[PDB]
Assembly symmetry: C3
Homo-oligomer: 159 residues x 3
């Protein structure tokens, strides 16, 4: 008999929770940032070298974006919209293994589908950073870290 009121309060409370999330996302997207599945992304307007871009991303409480899933890869290459963007792709260690600067473990197995066919070709033996280039799932290219490009920052949505 009273179970009705309890349930109303409940829907209202869940409604409240969703309004809170949308609001938080809106305040951020309102400031020229993008948003996708738990993360905020910034697509720069000015080109930088890989490291200056990273340094910039850090100054905005984020990192050059990592890619952790196929849906994220697809969001990135689609939002990139034909323009080329530095991402968190960079060689580290004494092995020249690829890595994410934000320290996401690099998924070798899954990443295979994310490279432009033929890349990374390490041209000139001087291509130790990665960018998003092609308008396809197979989007990544290795390029010299000192070349300037637009870049993409990423930081997690946190209540």
């Amino acid at each position: 008999l009273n179970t009705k009121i309890r349930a109303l309060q409940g829907s209202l409370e869940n409604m409240s929770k969703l309004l809170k999330r949308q609001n938080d996302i809106l305040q951020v997207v309102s400031q020229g940032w993008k948003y996708f599945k738990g993360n905020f992304y910034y697509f720069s307007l000015i080109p930088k070298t890989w490291y200056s871009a990273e340094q910039f991303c850090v100054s905005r409480n984020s990192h050059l974006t990592s890619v952790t899933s196929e849906s994220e890869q697809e969001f990135l290459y689609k939002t990139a919209g034909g323009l080329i963007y530095w991402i968190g792709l960079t060689k580290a260690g004494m092995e020249g293994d690829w890595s994410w600067v934000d320290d996401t473990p690099f998924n070798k197995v899954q990443s295979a589908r994310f490279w432009i066919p033929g890349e990374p070709n390490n041209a000139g033996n001087n291509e130790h950073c990665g960018n998003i280039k092609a308008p396809s799932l197979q989007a990544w290219n290795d390029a010299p870290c000192d070349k300037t490009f637009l870049f993409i920052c990423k930081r997690p949505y946190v209540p």
Copy 2:
């Protein structure tokens, strides 16, 4: 009594629907798209020829935008903000038509052209773009010119 309870019930499910709808819009706008009156719009950062622009829209499950109302025309010219954008205008005969198969209204469209256009300059201007910062915004240009472009796709919850 129950009378006023199902009232709260109703208004509550109505907001839920309203909130869901705002989320749908937020999600797409969060991916760099625009929204206006039941349609999503994409104003590109990259310029392309008309043909390549359309392929680009198709690959995003949309089409170069049509224009169905002065209201839409105003949203488009304002948002273009002084830049030139390919839209879904193309010849087919040679009558003008919308690439998304929206029926082209000669009469309504008469008002949307820049004064003096379509001038078919060089006799090779078979595509349309938004150029002037006003309701009279469209110019016809050669399909091979490379301009920014605008995609359109319906909002569906």
Copy 3:
């Protein structure tokens, strides 16, 4: 107790009514902001901003703003300065800074009072420098709180419009 059960139940129903109506109000605010943001504008703390895509002279930039029911943006706080320079993304944008000719004081085109004290820390070090006795306008230039440069008003830059969010209630 049957009397207390009635009281409680009622106060709770009145409460739900209060909240449901408040929520409706908050969805409307969400919708106001969303509609404008969905249209290429930005939003920050009670104000909408337009970061232009096309460059203009200072006077022509202001003119455009007026046509979109706004003005070249003023800077009223550190928080707004930071929002502006960070959102500028490294690009140069005209703002509402304007000097009354030679030896004139600096003012805001939207009539916001100019805080000579505060403003000191918003200029790039060394500005305003009036290079050429020509620079009667201000722009956001450097990616820092010390961001402002004075430049000749006939230079063409991208520009930033600003207008208050006034709820449609």
